[PDB]
Write a protein that holds these residues in place. Structure first.
Motif, mmCIF file in Angstrom:
data_model
loop_
_atom_site.group_PDB
_atom_site.id
_atom_site.type_symbol
_atom_site.label_atom_id
_atom_site.label_comp_id
_atom_site.label_asym_id
_atom_site.label_seq_id
_atom_site.Cartn_x
_atom_site.Cartn_y
_atom_site.Cartn_z
ATOM 1 N N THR A 1 0.822 -1.206 0.000
ATOM 2 C CA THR A 1 0.000 0.000 0.000
ATOM 3 C C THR A 1 0.871 1.277 0.000
ATOM 4 O OG1 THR A 1 -0.120 0.168 2.400
ATOM 5 C CG2 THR A 1 -1.778 -1.229 1.251
ATOM 6 N N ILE A 2 0.257 2.409 -0.361
ATOM 7 C CA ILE A 2 0.951 3.699 -0.370
ATOM 8 C C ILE A 2 1.511 4.037 0.995
ATOM 9 C CG2 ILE A 2 0.601 6.257 -0.546
ATOM 10 C CD1 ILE A 2 -1.572 5.425 -2.839
ATOM 11 N N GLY B 1 -12.668 14.439 2.548
ATOM 12 C CA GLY B 1 -13.872 13.749 2.123
ATOM 13 C C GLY B 1 -14.888 13.688 3.225
ATOM 14 N N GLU C 1 -10.298 8.902 3.475
ATOM 15 C CA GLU C 1 -10.784 8.908 4.839
ATOM 16 C C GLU C 1 -10.019 7.943 5.725
ATOM 17 O OE1 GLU C 1 -13.031 8.294 2.224
ATOM 18 O OE2 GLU C 1 -14.525 9.876 2.321
ATOM 19 N N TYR D 1 -4.954 -0.637 10.426
ATOM 20 C CA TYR D 1 -6.305 -0.971 10.006
ATOM 21 C C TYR D 1 -6.285 -2.152 9.021
ATOM 22 C CZ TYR D 1 -5.481 0.749 5.328
ATOM 23 O OH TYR D 1 -4.966 0.929 4.082
ATOM 24 N N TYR E 1 -11.688 -1.750 4.200
ATOM 25 C CA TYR E 1 -12.146 -0.475 3.724
ATOM 26 C C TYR E 1 -13.671 -0.451 3.789
ATOM 27 C CZ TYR E 1 -13.220 -3.224 -0.483
ATOM 28 O OH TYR E 1 -13.714 -4.175 -1.354
ATOM 29 N N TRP F 1 -5.654 6.214 -8.562
ATOM 30 C CA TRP F 1 -6.210 7.579 -8.298
ATOM 31 C C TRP F 1 -7.471 7.854 -9.117
ATOM 32 C CZ3 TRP F 1 -4.595 12.301 -11.433
ATOM 33 C CH2 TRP F 1 -5.132 13.469 -10.912
ATOM 34 N N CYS G 1 -10.068 6.073 -9.482
ATOM 35 C CA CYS G 1 -10.618 4.902 -10.167
ATOM 36 C C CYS G 1 -11.461 3.952 -9.280
ATOM 37 C CB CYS G 1 -9.488 4.139 -10.830
ATOM 38 S SG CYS G 1 -8.539 5.169 -11.991
ATOM 39 N N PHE H 1 -14.630 7.451 -7.765
ATOM 40 C CA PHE H 1 -14.716 8.476 -8.805
ATOM 41 C C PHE H 1 -14.811 7.931 -10.226
ATOM 42 C CE2 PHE H 1 -13.431 12.632 -6.493
ATOM 43 C CZ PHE H 1 -14.524 12.496 -5.677
ATOM 44 N N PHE I 1 1.101 1.354 -6.871
ATOM 45 C CA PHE I 1 0.479 0.222 -6.180
ATOM 46 C C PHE I 1 -0.888 -0.083 -6.782
ATOM 47 C CE2 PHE I 1 3.417 2.172 -3.293
ATOM 48 C CZ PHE I 1 4.147 1.076 -2.893
ATOM 49 N N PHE J 1 -3.005 -2.384 -5.857
ATOM 50 C CA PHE J 1 -3.960 -2.780 -4.827
ATOM 51 C C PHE J 1 -4.700 -4.110 -5.178
ATOM 52 C CE2 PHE J 1 -7.590 -1.985 -1.863
ATOM 53 C CZ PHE J 1 -6.905 -1.660 -0.706
HETATM 54 C C1 A8P Z 1 -9.720 -2.372 -5.762
HETATM 55 C C2 A8P Z 1 -11.173 -1.950 -5.799
HETATM 56 C C3 A8P Z 1 -11.904 -1.849 -4.450
HETATM 57 C C4 A8P Z 1 -11.153 -1.197 -3.292
HETATM 58 C C5 A8P Z 1 -11.741 0.116 -2.714
HETATM 59 C C6 A8P Z 1 -11.154 0.406 -1.344
HETATM 60 C C7 A8P Z 1 -10.817 1.821 -0.959
HETATM 61 C C8 A8P Z 1 -9.348 2.057 -0.893
HETATM 62 N N1 A8P Z 1 -8.686 2.179 -1.957
HETATM 63 C C9 A8P Z 1 -7.345 2.135 -1.847
HETATM 64 N N2 A8P Z 1 -6.602 2.181 -0.765
HETATM 65 C C10 A8P Z 1 -5.305 2.082 -1.225
HETATM 66 C C11 A8P Z 1 -4.061 2.099 -0.549
HETATM 67 N N3 A8P Z 1 -3.924 2.200 0.791
HETATM 68 N N4 A8P Z 1 -2.953 2.005 -1.306
HETATM 69 C C12 A8P Z 1 -3.103 1.896 -2.618
HETATM 70 N N5 A8P Z 1 -4.203 1.872 -3.361
HETATM 71 C C13 A8P Z 1 -5.281 1.969 -2.597
HETATM 72 N N6 A8P Z 1 -6.601 1.990 -3.003
HETATM 73 C C14 A8P Z 1 -7.067 1.926 -4.400
HETATM 74 O O1 A8P Z 1 -7.521 3.203 -4.786
HETATM 75 C C15 A8P Z 1 -8.674 3.072 -5.620
HETATM 76 C C16 A8P Z 1 -9.470 4.338 -5.521
HETATM 77 O O2 A8P Z 1 -9.867 4.545 -4.165
HETATM 78 P P1 A8P Z 1 -11.006 5.568 -3.808
HETATM 79 O O3 A8P Z 1 -10.891 5.966 -2.338
HETATM 80 O O4 A8P Z 1 -12.347 5.089 -4.225
HETATM 81 O O5 A8P Z 1 -10.494 6.832 -4.627
HETATM 82 P P2 A8P Z 1 -11.189 7.854 -5.632
HETATM 83 O O6 A8P Z 1 -11.809 7.057 -6.785
HETATM 84 O O7 A8P Z 1 -10.234 8.916 -6.041
HETATM 85 O O8 A8P Z 1 -12.332 8.451 -4.719
HETATM 86 C C17 A8P Z 1 -12.249 9.806 -4.222
HETATM 87 C C18 A8P Z 1 -13.348 10.010 -3.218
HETATM 88 N N7 A8P Z 1 -13.287 9.009 -2.137
HETATM 89 C C19 A8P Z 1 -13.208 9.709 -0.834
HETATM 90 C C20 A8P Z 1 -12.510 11.011 -1.215
HETATM 91 O O9 A8P Z 1 -12.653 11.977 -0.177
HETATM 92 C C21 A8P Z 1 -13.277 11.354 -2.490
HETATM 93 O O10 A8P Z 1 -14.587 11.871 -2.146
HETATM 94 C C22 A8P Z 1 -9.328 1.809 -5.100
HETATM 95 O O11 A8P Z 1 -10.181 1.301 -6.112
HETATM 96 C C23 A8P Z 1 -8.134 0.891 -4.773
HETATM 97 O O12 A8P Z 1 -7.762 0.099 -5.904
#
Ligand code: A8P
Length: 507
Positions: free
Chosen positions: A269-270, A289, A300, A336, A339, A414, A416, A419, A444, A446
Motif C-alpha cells: 500500500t501507499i 472527504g 478517509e 487498520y 475499507y 487515483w 478509479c 470516482f 500500487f 492494490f
Molecule cells: C480495488 C477496488 C476496491 C477497493 C476500494 C477500497 C478503498 C481504498 N482504496 C485504496 N486504498 C489504497 C491504498 N492504501 N494504497 C493503494 N491503493 C489503494 N486503493 C485503491 O484506490 C482506488 C481508488 O480509491 P477511492 O478511495 O475510491 O479513490 P477515488 O476514486 O479517487 O475516490 C475519491 C473520493 N473518495 C473519498 C474522497 O474523499 C473522495 O470523495 C481503489 O479502487 C483501490 O484500488
C-alpha cells in the motif's frame, strides 16, 4: 507472475536522504509558524508563539472558539465560557456528552443525531472500556480542548483559494484543535445554509455521532486511539500544511521530456510501502472527504490513521482545478484492515519515521482530487485529460527543487474507485505528470496483478521507443478522436492500450 515489475524499489529516491538541507524555519509572508523557532528542540514540546493569546475574528483567519467575539444570543453571552461550563461536568453516560455538546449548539438540538455515539458507548464497548472512556479519555480531551487559548496563541490564516501559503504548527497545537472539533466547538461551521464557510469542509465531528452504520464504532476506535495517545503524552513534532496553486501548466503536446522510471506492484500500500516517498491521497476537492461523517475509503482511511490530517479541514478552502494541499509531518497512530464496510481498527501504531530538521515526521502527503466521472467516456475528452494531467502535475511539482532531491511518487488507482476513472488511463496520466515534474513513479495496483503487468508493458514499450510526454499525449488525443468523440454507445470499440500499441507499431 511476479509480485512487482520494472525498476527495483531500492533504486527509487526516498526522504529524508534524498532531501536538500532544510533552510532554517522562520515565519514570513507566505509561511505562518505558530511556535518559537528559536526554542525548537528534539524531544521537547514546542513553545507557542506568541506567548499570550492574540485573536483575529475576520474573513481571513480561523474563527477560534475561545475568541471574545464568539458570542451567543442570550443580550450577547460568551460562548467560550458556556463551552467551559458545559464540558467541565463529569460524564457517566453518553447522554451527558450529548447534552454537554448541545448546550453551546442549541440551534442543532433537533438536527444533530447522537445514535452512533450512544451505541458505541453503551452497545459496543465493554464495561471497563466505557469506564476508561468517560473517566479518563473524555476528561483529558476536555482539558486539552479548554487549553486552546494557551496552546494556539497565534491566529491561524485560512488557506483560501489561489493562496500559495504554508502553516507550520506543533502536533500539540493540532491535538488541542482536534479535541475542540470532537466537542463541536468551532463556530460558523455548522449551518447547512452558511455562506462564509460554505466553500470549506466540515470540521466539527457531529456527523461521526449520527446513524447506525457498523463503521462508526471503527471510526471512533481509530480516533480515540489517537486522542488517548496525544492527551496521555504530548507529541513533540511539527506538521506543515501547504496550499499550492500553479499558474503555468505545461503545453503537453509540445513537452519533449522523456518518461521517468516505474516500479509497479499488486502487493503493498501507499502508506506502508511508500516510506520517504511523496504519498498521494486520492482526495475530494473538499479535503478529507467524509472523514467526519460516513466516508471510509482511501482518503478517509488515511485521515483516520493519521488524524493530524483532519485539521486541514479547519483552514483549507475547497481545491480548484489548479491546486493541491501538501502535508508534511503527520504521524501514523493506528493500523487498520479493509475499507468501507470491512474497515476495522486493528491496533495502535508506533510511528518509527525519522524527523527532519523542523521536527516533522519524514512523511509527505499530497491531496490531489481526481474528477468524479458519471459516464466512462467523459474522461477521454481532451479538456478532462488535460485537467487530470495538470492536477497530478501541481501535486507532484516542487518549484525550485532539483530532480535529484525529489523522492519518487507513491501512488495508485487515483480516481478509479468512487470516482469511476479508468486505471489504465489514469496511470498513464500520472506517469506523464511525474515525467514533466521529473519524478519517478511507484505505482500500487492494490491486488490487481493484471493491471500491474499492463502498466509495466505499456511504460516499457513507450520507454524503449523513446516517446516523449508530448508524443504520448498526442496519442491520447488520437484515441479520443478515433474511438470516443463520435462514439454513441457507452463504451469505445477498442481499449486505450491496444490502440496505443497499434498506433505506434504501425507507424
Ligand atoms: C480495488 C477496488 C476496491 C477497493 C476500494 C477500497 C478503498 C481504498 N482504496 C485504496 N486504498 C489504497 C491504498 N492504501 N494504497 C493503494 N491503493 C489503494 N486503493 C485503491 O484506490 C482506488 C481508488 O480509491 P477511492 O478511495 O475510491 O479513490 P477515488 O476514486 O479517487 O475516490 C475519491 C473520493 N473518495 C473519498 C474522497 O474523499 C473522495 O470523495 C481503489 O479502487 C483501490 O484500488
Amino acid at each position: 507472475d511476479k509480485k512487482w515489475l520494472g525498476t527495483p524499489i531500492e533504486e527509487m529516491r526516498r526522504m529524508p536522504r534524498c532531501g536538500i538541507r532544510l533552510p532554517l524555519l522562520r515565519p514570513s509572508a507566505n509561511h505562518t509558524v505558530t511556535i518559537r523557532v528559536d526554542l525548537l528542540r528534539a524531544g521537547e514540546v514546542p513553545k507557542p508563539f506568541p506567548t499570550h493569546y492574540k485573536d483575529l475574528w475576520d474573513n481571513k483567519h480561523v474563527k477560534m472558539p475561545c475568541s471574545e467575539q464568539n458570542l451567543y444570543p442570550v443580550t450577547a453571552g460568551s460562548r467560550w465560557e458556556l463551552i467551559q461550563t458545559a464540558l467541565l461536568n463529569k460524564f457517566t453516560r453518553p447522554q451527558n456528552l450529548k447534552d454537554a455538546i448541545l448546550k453551546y449548539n442549541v440551534a442543532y438540538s433537533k438536527k444533530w443525531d447522537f445514535t452512533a455515539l450512544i451505541d458505541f458507548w453503551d452497545k459496543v464497548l465493554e464495561e471497563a472500556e466505557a469506564q476508561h472512556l468517560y473517566q479518563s479519555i473524555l476528561p483529558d480531551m476536555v482539558k486539552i480542548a479548554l487549553c486552546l487559548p494557551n496552546i494556539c496563541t497565534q491566529p491561524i490564516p485560512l488557506l483560501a483559494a489561489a493562496m500559495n501559503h504554508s502553516i507550520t504548527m506543533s502536533q500539540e497545537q493540532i491535538a488541542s484543535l482536534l479535541a475542540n472539533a470532537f466537542f463541536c466547538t468551532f463556530p460558523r461551521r455548522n449551518a447547512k445554509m452558511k455562506s462564509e464557510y460554505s466553500s470549506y469542509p466540515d470540521i466539527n465531528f457531529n456527523r461521526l455521532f449520527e446513524g447506525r452504520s457498523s463503521r462508526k464504532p471503527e471510526k471512533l476506535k481509530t480516533l480515540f486511539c489517537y486522542f488517548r495517545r496525544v492527551t496521555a503524552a504530548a507529541p513533540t513534532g511539527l506538521v506543515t500544511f501547504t496550499r499550492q496553486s500553479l499558474e503555468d501548466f505545461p503545453e503537453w503536446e509540445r513537452c519533449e521530456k522523456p518518461l521517468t522510471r516505474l516500479h509497479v506492484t499488486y502487493e503493498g500500500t501507499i502508506e506502508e510501502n511508500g516510506q520517504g516517498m511523496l504519498q498521494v491521497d486520492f482526495a475530494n476537492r473538499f479535503v478529507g472527504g467524509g472523514v467526519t461523517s460516513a466516508g471510509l475509503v482511501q482518503e478517509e482511511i488515511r485521515f483516520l490513521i493519521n488524524p493530524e490530517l483532519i485539521i486541514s479541514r479547519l483552514f483549507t478552502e475547497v481545491l480548484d482545478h489548479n491546486e493541491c494541499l501538501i502535508i508534511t509531518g503527520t504521524e501514523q497512530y493506528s493500523e487498520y484492515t479493509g475499507y468501507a464496510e470491512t474497515y476495522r481498527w486493528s491496533r495502535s501504531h508506533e510511528d518509527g519515521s525519522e524527523r527532519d530538521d523542523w521536527q516533522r515526521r519524514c512523511t509527505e502527503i499530497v491531496a490531489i482530487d481526481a474528477l468524479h466521472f458519471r459516464r466512462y467516456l467523459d474522461q477521454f475528452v481532451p479538456e478532462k485529460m488535460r485537467r487530470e494531467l495538470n492536477k497530478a502535475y501541481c501535486g507532484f511539482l516542487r518549484p525550485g527543487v532539483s530532480s535529484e532531491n525529489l523522492s519518487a511518487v507513491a501512488t495508485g488507482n487515483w480516481g478509479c474507485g468512487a470516482f469511476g476513472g479508468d486505471a489504465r488511463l489514469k496511470a498513464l496520466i500520472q506517469i506523464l505528470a511525474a515525467a514533466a515534474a521529473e519524478r519517478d513513479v511507484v505505482y500500487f495496483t492494490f491486488g490487481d496483478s493484471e493491471l500491474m503487468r499492463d502498466i509495466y508493458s505499456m511504460h516499457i514499450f513507450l520507454t524503449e521507443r523513446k516517446l516523449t510526454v508530448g508524443d504520448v499525449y498526442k496519442l491520447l488525443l488520437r484515441y479520443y478522436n478515433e474511438e470516443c468523440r463520435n462514439c454513441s454507445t457507452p463504451g469505445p470499440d477498442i481499449k486505450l492500450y491496444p490502440f496505443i500499441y497499434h498506433a505506434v507499431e504501425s507507424c
